[PDB]
Amino acid sequence: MEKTHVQLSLPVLQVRDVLVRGFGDSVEEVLSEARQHLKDGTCGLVEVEKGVLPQLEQPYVFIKRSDARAPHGHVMVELVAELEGIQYGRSGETLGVLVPHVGEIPVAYRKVLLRKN
Ligand SMILES: C[C@H](N)c1ccc(Cl)cc1
């Protein structure tokens, strides 16, 4: 059975390498697909810097810090989607935007403890 949180190590991708620049076409779909790719080990993370979001496809799926005081290095996170400037969920600081991973070479791995909600 699925625990409330799962430890994952996500490949961190540079935005210009990403081949599939979002998870879908509605908030509900992107959240659903992100969660599936996270379970399958086929989800990457792009760190948000100036110029990143316009190079990715909306709706966006962010991982945001959900909790403080981070077990074994994995930051606790939850998913929040964004479309047209409106966010679906509320949480803490953004760690990055999730994208499909289809074999791109990462620059780093990001350890997270993901809330499965
Ligand atoms: C497994 C298949 N080649 C696939 C990769 C990425 C996405 Cl987003 C959907 C399907």
Author numbering: 9 to 77, 79 to 126
Per the authors:
Nsp1 is a two-domain protein with a short C-terminal domain, which is involved in the shutdown of host expression by blocking the entry of host mRNA in the ribosome. The C-terminal domain is connected via a linker region with the larger N-terminal domain, which is thought to be involved in circumventing the shutdown of expression of viral mRNA and stabilising the binding of the C-terminus to the ribosome. Therefore, nsp1 is considered as a potential target for antiviral drug discovery. Using sulphur and chlorine anomalous difference Fourier maps, we report the unambiguous identification of the binding orientation of four nsp1-targeting fragment hits.
Whereas the previous three fragment hits can be considered as chemically closely related analogues, 7H2 represents a smaller fragment of 155 Da containing a single central phenyl ring with two distinct substituents binding to a shallower site on nsp1. Due to its quasi-symmetrical structure, a rotation around its long axis does not lead to a new distinct orientation, as the ethan-1-amine substituent contains a rotatable bond. However, a vertical axis through its phenyl ring will lead to two distinct orientations with each of the two substituents changing positions. The peak disappears in the 2.75 keV anomalous difference Fourier map (same rmsd level), consistent with the existence of a single chlorine in 7H2. Consequently, we fitted 7H2 into the density with the chloro substituent located at the centre of the anomalous peak, in the opposite direction of our previously published orientation. The overlapping local electron density maps for these residues are exemplified using the nsp1-7H2 complex at two diffraction energies.
